[PDB]
């Protein structure tokens, strides 16, 4: 080189990997992304600007907030188990079931998708897969 000044290589932050496409120095542009299943904080798009002393990205180190998911759609009569209990965040899987008096008994049975898990399909909110399970 000779003179251009680089806005410092963007260090892979909270899970979100940076995409150093063109370069990193002045004029150069890249793109950040919190992989799959993660909300990107700040701005993915960035351009290496320069005030005078040192080159810096017009944006700022993008973060990555974990997509929070609430409780899974509880089916009538059907119970709830698995890892999930209260500390719901994302990905957590839950196994459905159905009443049985108190210790197993021919009284309603789970049918279809006996298990689900946290996911995303509308930003935050933390929408699961679907309340398909049903007692019969």
Swiss-Prot record:
Location within or outside the cell: Membrane
Tissue localization of expression: Present on erythrocytes, a subset of T cells, mature B cells, follicular dendritic cells, monocytes and granulocytes.
Disulfide partners: 7-48, 34-64, 69-118, 98-135
Domain of life: Eukaryota
Domain Sushi: 5-66, 67-136
Glycosylation sites: 31
Function field: Membrane immune adherence receptor that plays a critical role in the capture and clearance of complement-opsonized pathogens by erythrocytes and monocytes/macrophages. Mediates the binding by these cells of particles and immune complexes that have activated complement to eliminate them from the circulation. Also acts in the inhibition of spontaneous complement activation by impairing the formation and function of the alternative and classical pathway C3/C5 convertases, and by serving as a cofactor for the cleavage by factor I of C3b to iC3b, C3c and C3d,g, and of C4b to C4c and C4d.
Subunit structure of this chain's protein: Interacts (via Sushi 1 and Sushi 2 domains) with complement factor C4b. Interacts (via Sushi 8 and Sushi 9 domains) with complement factor C3b. Interacts (via Sushi 24 and Sushi 25 domains) with MBL2. Interacts with FCN2. Interacts (via Sushi 24 and Sushi 25 domains) with C1QA. Interacts with CR2.
Family that this chain belongs to: Belongs to the receptors of complement activation (RCA) family.
Name this protein carries in UniProt: Complement receptor type 1
Positions spanned in the full protein: 1002 to 1133 of 2039
């Amino acid at each position: 080189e000779a003179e251009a000044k680089s806005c410092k290589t963007p260090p892979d932050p909270v899970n979100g990997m940076v995409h150093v496409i063109t370069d990193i120095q002045v004029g150069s542009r890249i793109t950040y992304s919190c992989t799959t299943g993660h909300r990107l904080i700040g701005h993915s798009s960035a351009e290496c600007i320069l005030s005078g002393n040192t080159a810096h990205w017009s944006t700022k180190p993008p973060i990555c907030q974990r997509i929070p998911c609430g409780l899974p759609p509880t089916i009538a009569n059907g119970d709830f188990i698995s890892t999930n209990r209260e500390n719901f965040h994302y990905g957590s899987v839950v196994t459905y079931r159905c009443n049985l008096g108190s210790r197993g008994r021919k009284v309603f049975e789970l049918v279809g998708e006996p298990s689900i898990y946290c996911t995303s399909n509308d930003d935050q909110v933390g929408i699961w897969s679907g309340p398909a399970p049903q007692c019969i």
